[PDB]
Design a protein around this ligand. Structure first.
Ligand SMILES: CCOC(=O)[C@H](Cc1ccccc1)NC(=O)[C@@H]1CSCCN1S(=O)(=O)c1ccc(C)cc1
Length: 107
């Protein structure tokens, strides 16, 4: 599933609701720890609507547990990410994914 390990705490009271747009900054890594993507390096937060299934299951469920302001490490097993298929061109089959995600704002 998805594990959430806090880096820096959020407000502990404002949690994303389905239908809201989560605004975040993230870095993604495979098990070797190497960065394969980063919104921070583009200096532009990434946005997604919780519940629209436009991000992997680990992200919908992991970010849903965070509060605004929280920065956490999300460790996602393959079944909650790309499974046996992977995402051709960047994530191989059977990949556990680790993301550093900071929930910046809700819109
Ligand atoms: C039910 C499935 O939804 C999705 O697999 C998506 C769709 C998407 C891919 C790249 C950029 C934006 C949106 N990606 C991710 O959920 C995940 C987490 S959210 C950040 C994006 N990425 S990722 O960082 O793991 C990734 C980066 C680049 C590529 C090309 C593919 C995946």
């Amino acid at each position: 599933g998805v594990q959430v390990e806090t880096i820096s705490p959020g407000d502990g009271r404002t949690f994303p609701k389905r239908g809201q747009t989560c605004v975040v900054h993230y870095t993604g890594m495979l098990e070797d720890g190497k960065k394969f993507d980063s919104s921070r390096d583009r200096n532009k937060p990434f946005k997604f609507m919780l519940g629209k299934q436009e991000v992997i299951r680990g992200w919908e469920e992991g970010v849903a547990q965070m509060s605004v302001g929280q920065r956490a490490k999300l460790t996602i097993s393959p079944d909650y990410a790309y499974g046996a298929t992977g995402h051709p061109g960047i994530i191989p089959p059977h990949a556990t994914l680790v993301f550093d995600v900071e929930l910046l704002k809700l819109e």
